[PDB]
Amino acid sequence: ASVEFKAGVKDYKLTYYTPEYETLDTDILAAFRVSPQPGVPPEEAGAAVAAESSTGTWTTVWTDGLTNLDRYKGRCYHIEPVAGEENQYICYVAYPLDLFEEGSVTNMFTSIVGNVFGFKALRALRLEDLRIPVAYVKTFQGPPHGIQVERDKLNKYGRPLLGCTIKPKLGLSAKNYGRAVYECLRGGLDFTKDDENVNSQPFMRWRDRFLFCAEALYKAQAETGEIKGHYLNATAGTCEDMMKRAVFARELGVPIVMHDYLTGGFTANTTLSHYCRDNGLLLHIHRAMHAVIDRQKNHGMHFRVLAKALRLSGGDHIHSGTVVGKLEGERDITLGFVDLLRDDYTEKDRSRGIYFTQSWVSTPGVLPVASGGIHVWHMPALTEIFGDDSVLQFGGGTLGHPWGNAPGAVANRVALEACVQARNEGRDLAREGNTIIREATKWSPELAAACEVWKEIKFEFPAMDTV
Amino acid sequence: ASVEFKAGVKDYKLTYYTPEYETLDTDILAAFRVSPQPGVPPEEAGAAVAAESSTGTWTTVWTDGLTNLDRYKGRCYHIEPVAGEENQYICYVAYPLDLFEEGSVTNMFTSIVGNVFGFKALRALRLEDLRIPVAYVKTFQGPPHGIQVERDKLNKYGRPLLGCTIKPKLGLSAKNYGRAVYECLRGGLDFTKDDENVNSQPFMRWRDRFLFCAEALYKAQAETGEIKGHYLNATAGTCEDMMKRAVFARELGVPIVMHDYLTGGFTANTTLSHYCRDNGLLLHIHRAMHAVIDRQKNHGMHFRVLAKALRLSGGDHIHSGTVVGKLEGERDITLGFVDLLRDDYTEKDRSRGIYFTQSWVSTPGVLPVASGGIHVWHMPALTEIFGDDSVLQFGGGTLGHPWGNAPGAVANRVALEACVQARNEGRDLAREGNTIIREATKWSPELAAACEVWKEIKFEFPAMDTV
Amino acid sequence: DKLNKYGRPLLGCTIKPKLGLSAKNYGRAVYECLRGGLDFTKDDENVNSQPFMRWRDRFLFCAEALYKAQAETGEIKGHYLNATAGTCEDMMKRAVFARELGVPIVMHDYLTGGFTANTTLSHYCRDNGLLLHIHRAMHAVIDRQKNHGMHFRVLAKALRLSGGDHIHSGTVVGKLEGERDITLGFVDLLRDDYTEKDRSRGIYFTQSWVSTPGVLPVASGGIHVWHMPALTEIFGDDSVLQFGGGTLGHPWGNAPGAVANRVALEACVQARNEGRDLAREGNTIIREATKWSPELAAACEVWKEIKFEFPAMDTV
Amino acid sequence: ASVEFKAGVKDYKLTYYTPEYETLDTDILAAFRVSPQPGVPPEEAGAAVAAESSTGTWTTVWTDGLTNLDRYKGRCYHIEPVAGEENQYICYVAYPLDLFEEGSVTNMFTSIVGNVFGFKALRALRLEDLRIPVAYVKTFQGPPHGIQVER
Amino acid sequence: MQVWPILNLKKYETLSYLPPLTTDQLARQVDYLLNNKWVPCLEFETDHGFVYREHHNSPGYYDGRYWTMWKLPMFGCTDPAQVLNELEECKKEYPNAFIRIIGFDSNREVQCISFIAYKPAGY
Amino acid sequence: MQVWPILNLKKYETLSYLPPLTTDQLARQVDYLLNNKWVPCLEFETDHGFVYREHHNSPGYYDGRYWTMWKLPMFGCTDPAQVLNELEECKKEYPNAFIRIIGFDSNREVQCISFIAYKPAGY
Ligand SMILES: O=C(O)[C@@](O)(COP(=O)(O)O)[C@H](O)[C@H](O)COP(=O)(O)O
Ligand SMILES: O=C(O)[C@@](O)(COP(=O)(O)O)[C@H](O)[C@H](O)COP(=O)(O)O
Ligand SMILES: O=C(O)[C@@](O)(COP(=O)(O)O)[C@H](O)[C@H](O)COP(=O)(O)O
Ligand SMILES: [Ca+2]
Ligand SMILES: [Ca+2]
Ligand SMILES: [Ca+2]
């Protein structure tokens, strides 16, 4: 009960290393991959991260005695050595519920990842996982709609959904965008979308594009008899600008918009999430920029943390990687964070990179979206990895078809239904995949032409991100 | 003039590698540090980055022939091998003015840094620098005020400004916050601030803190006769919430607020920047999270790109590092981006990490803020590195003083003025620093007590981020 | 009645370099001018918001300066803050902040801004108690030549309808064109309730205003202390006389420049009021005042030779 | 670097006639058809137009020394005689980017065409053409739609 | 180069930058007012000699503009000795006040004349 | 443990936490200003020595920031004895004022120097 104030510096580990602490169920837990500089013991490194992401600075401060430092301090409670690594440790840090602002992903990241990554005393730091306690989860809205409500709004059951980014990424005009959207949607795709970087520009202004894309999607809906969507992008330079685009989409009565949550940011994304709940709009989330942060094993933040953060802030879809296409993603790690995105409960499982048991107290689940370098011959593997609750998107795979967009869409829709029928009849998609596709080419000329064009194309490289 | 559509995949370098291209003065130029996978030639790696950050996807699309691909395509126009590195190159990429949304840092990052960092064909990618053309610079507001106007508003001339983060980072109450702010400001500091993660929480709600910090700052102003500020934090979960805090600060008539621009995000920060211009508020920018992205030399984005982006979006202050204190920053690299933040024109200078000549067409300059692990014996070096146009902040260096906050503040103010007098009289700060400090301790008891406490403390470690 | 000013022409002054000064240097210059006895200072017609000086900073510093000059001297002061802008929304934002500062007068460029925008601002200024100074930038594109265009008297009548409390009228004797009789004609068309056809002054029609308020004519552009007698004779009490160069070009600085102009004008007003003839005794009136006013004496030495005498393009 | 303030009037052409200036690509350029009064040389006429559409007035002001007049001043950089005309010249004037308010045609016309057409020292003045630099173009929206989108 | 002083340099609108009116100069200002057929009036003030802002701050609102009327405007006056006489009576009764002379034009309803005629001790 | 005093501890921005400038130290600040080629100017104030808020209260508005200019900025000055001489002239005329020396940079349009050079009685 009050010890004298003693000015001067002392080791962090005297206050912030706490190997006997039992974690509270209201605590936020962090798993950090820490690489200390030569001569810094792991206890002091772990302590330093805990102190500086919570309550401490570099010298002793008299004002600690006005409060109760031991109820607020973050604390390194466990240290585990990394197998096969010189001087690299998993440090576990616990943060009391009271440190965080309710409903704010921004504040949660600001503390846990704010300044500690630039410490001179560390060579490298990566945040691998977070345990988000159910008392903090309940302070957030989460997805505007979630998987159950999305399928009920769209009347779509029993198969993965199909989408497609319009190509030339940039440079098409508003009316050519709509022309391409109509021909894609009428061949059997459920969705088309704006490229992540199509916002508003000299070659195509946003309000013109929204209006022509509404005419095109309604024309394909009436021809086919199935509900159609086109993800209109609301990403913009300011909140006012972002809000104006969500407002006009509402006015057009269309089902879904999109946002680039990391390049727009969490403050803006939470705003739009709340608007889409209030107005019945589906929200597709694109993760542009994530790999700047999440690619390397030694340093950054793993995608699973960024995906949990999106689930809290809010979105109905999030890109999850494809495993087999042009961008990186290992099968087991991917299955791990797909479960963290879709399910109510996920047990600790270090073989899939899950460091903490995580519960969601009925937060709606997000639909994983697989996109980037995939084509008809990938269909069997994609259906096996993600199952029914995903969206599979083919941009190049639809707009690169020899006969145009409608035929490109037919091919993808026929391939997917062929996989679904075969799976449902008991066939093994991993082993009979090519035979399933090959059978469907005998009655579908459109799939046959797609099969010929891409039969040799594969993306196989050594992964940078392994368990 | 129109060649037939040929479906199928072909190499990126056929369209996107363009070594004879002369850059336009309206182009955005990117310098990328690329590390290809084994077997991927640098030309194809460079082409792949340009294609996929601009117009191209993985297979050939017929819709290219509706536009003019050659006027919109991004293009790799120069490749330079990195000395001392196996399989690492600087690839230079040019992006036409028309690809970008006016006034949107969000859109500029989305294109250049959006998807290319996760390509299977690369092992690592780092964006080192950007040449922002003056025609794109003019589409942005820039800082609300900038250096000249800030000194004129505050009536402060001829010395670096002095600041101070309140400690216990988290856990102080609203009234103890203001008590600490009064005692710091009355001893000669110009500024105090919210810690980056104090937003609104169970231990201290924001509106209570703003109110008590206003009473305290006005009391210190009246006692001393010098204008005072306290950076009130507006960072929050939503734009609505952020706006509400900037609105209450406006109502209290105080001079300066703060935002965490990377954890809040660029869409939100541009909104707040426009509000601060419209309402005469100074805007202090904290860079929490930057080191997740910018620490490692092989992968991510260098701080200079994140600093240029803040100058466009807008801020009157930005944290710049200290060089000598607890967080990493090399002297020459730091001098480089301090010039990019303050000046109207900066010539290419590879020895300070400046890849491109950059002009600002009178965009106001940002004040660099040096903070984190610094104390009175650092004053001479700090004054030498940054000069008059900076803010030097001492959190632990004020609230860790043995006699309390007022005497803490006196010691820092006396040390700084001692350095300024000596500099102005022709003395060499690098060589005579300890003697200048020592001389001031003979007539300042406050500085003498500070000098005794921290005389041995230094932060010297190997840097991870070198030229 | 708002300004408590009676019995003489009012005195103003455009801040110089036209462009390029900062927000705080603008305010510094304003304080020194106003404290020496000018009633008004003003934004140059083209100072709006720019890279060298943004509008809201300028408004704020010019308020501190004008209030300091008012307290020192005991006389009400104003500085014409410019609301001219690219859009109506922007224009309105500036008139709103001037209102918030509690200052007496704003300005607008009515031809470059345009009549649609000008009428909007005129209604806002009536609704909120702001004086409205009107600058006629661009008028000489239209009104210079005798064969083609529109004479200024038509543009002046249109401004009286749309609305403004001040409009620039020319000086006759300074650097820009304006013939004495034509000017006297449209000055009466701007100030008076009724004006009879008079072809010798270019008035083609008898014109009545049914009590439309009168506009104060503003004389500005290339004038100095030695012109004071003639200006006072031409315009009389109901005018504003503005010296930009003629204040900021004074050898001793803005305060002394302002004193010189204020002393010159009071000397003319006293002499007129005592029965002296300003047309014939003008130079003697100024010369007498130089014996007790060092400030005016310095101004008189600097500009004694300076005259603007050229053939006119716009004659009856 | 700072010369003494000297009160009084001097010719415009001492500061604002600048025949060796190379135009910047951020400059606004004006082509003026100038007809001077008898006895006014074309250099002084062109100088007068440049000065009074940018930074200068009729006598010397001490406040020039608080700024950098040479970076803000408008400048007459070329003079071409008109064929078949007595006393008529095309004078070319350059104005720095920083003189103009972004997105405001109103401000651009106010500077370039505001007061100089009624100078006593000129008989007539016509602005024939303007070079609008791409950095200033980008501050404007332009047409709401434009030809392609309208069709 | 002379510096315009700062302290005790309060001014009083029209004519106050001239030397102090002599008795003949004051007489001629009253002749001028009467010759134009304006109505003379005297006004005086002891408490707030200069303008200030106590009760409001919006555009064009100032306190201290109204002073107090000495008797009534002298309608029909044609004799300058009356005006000067009332000035002496005002002075005798209020030796501690500021006193000004104004002249009204009833057709325009505008004061065409206003000047300070007497100032109390130390002013 | 010393307590930082409260009463009559008004400060004056740059250099005011140091001991009082000797004549040599004052000379060296003037040399520094001239060696950087900044324009020197003197400013003085008798009435409101410190900053206050009378006319407005919004963010960034303060009264008391403008002082009054002594003559004009000394454009082209290269001799410190001129600056010190003007300071002596200012002091003699205004012995009751606060007097400061400033130096302008015209390229940046920023004062790069500002310090208090004379203080009246009891300060
Ligand atoms: O730009 C692109 O590459 C895409 O449009 C795919 O185009 P194609 O369908 O033509 O490949 C998608 O955004 C990426 O899949 C994003 O990556 P991720 O899902 O990994 O975040
Ligand atoms: O949390 C902290 O550590 C600080 O308050 C400083 O504390 P002390 O003054 O007590 O050290 C600053 O935010 C860091 O300087 C931020 O880093 P940067 O400037 O590098 O972004
Ligand atoms: O730019 C200028 O020239 C002025 O500031 C005067 O400057 P000086 O006081 O320094 O001459 C005035 O706007 C002109 O008088 C406008 O002309 P007009 O009144 O004829 O419309
Ligand atoms: Ca895309
Ligand atoms: Ca901090
Ligand atoms: Ca003007």
What's the layout of helices and strands?
The structure is cut from a larger assembly and holds four copies of chain A and two copies of chain E (123 residues).
Chain A: H1 13-16, E1 28-36, H2 42-52, H3 69-72, E2 75-81, E3 89-95, H4 105-113, E4 122-131, H5 134-137, H6 147-154, E5 161-163, H7 174-185, E6 191-193, H8 206-224, E7 229-233, H9 239-252, E8 256-260, H10 261-264, H11 266-279, E9 282-286, H12 290-294, E10 300-301, H13 303-313, E11 317-319, H14 331-342, E12 345-346, E13 358-359, E14 367-371, H15 379-386, E15 391-393, H16 396-399, H17 405-424, H18 429-440, H19 445-454
Parallel strand pairs in A: 4-10, 5-15, 6-7, 7-8, 8-9, 9-11, 11-14, 14-15
Antiparallel strand pairs in A: 1-3, 1-4, 2-3, 12-13
Chain E: H1 23-35, E1 39-45, E2 68-70, H2 80-93, E3 98-105, E4 110-118
Antiparallel strand pairs in E: 1-2, 1-3, 3-4
The complex binds 2-carboxyarabinitol-1,5-diphosphate (CAP) (3 copies) and calcium ion (3 copies).
Give a quick precis of the structure.
Chain D: It is found in: Plastid, Chloroplast. Helix content of chain A is 40%, strand content 15%.
Protein described:
This is part of a larger assembly, with 4 copies of chain A and 2 copies of chain E (123 residues). Chain A is an alpha/beta fold and 467 residues long. Helices cover 40% and strands 15% of the residues of chain A. Chain A has helices spanning 13-16, 42-52, 69-72, 105-113, 134-137, 147-154, 174-185, 206-224, 239-252, 261-264, 266-279, 290-294, 303-313, 331-342, 379-386, 396-399, 405-424, 429-440, 445-454; strands at residues 28-36, 75-81, 89-95, 122-131, 161-163, 191-193, 229-233, 256-260, 282-286, 300-301, 317-319, 345-346, 358-359, 367-371, 391-393. In chain A, the strands form 3 sheets. Chain A has an 8-stranded parallel β-sheet with strand order 5-15-14-11-9-8-7-6. Chain A has a 5-stranded mixed β-sheet with strand order 2-3-1-4-10. In chain A, helix 7 (174-185) packs parallel to helix 17 and helix 8 runs parallel beside helix 9 (239-252). The two termini of chain A are 46 Å apart. By secondary structure, chain E is an alpha+beta fold. Chain E has one domain (1-123): 2-Layer Sandwich (Ribulose 1,5 Bisphosphate Carboxylase/Oxygenase), CATH 3.30.190. In chain E, 22% of the residues lie in helices and 22% in strands. Chain E contains 2 helices and 4 strands, in the order αββαββ. The chains are: A alpha/beta (467), E alpha+beta (123). The PDB classes it as lyase. The entry lists the keywords lyase, carbon-carbon, oxidoreductase, photosynthesis, carbon-dioxide fixation lyase (carbon-carbon). Activated spinach rubisco complexed with 2-carboxyarabinitol 2 bisphosphat and CA2+.
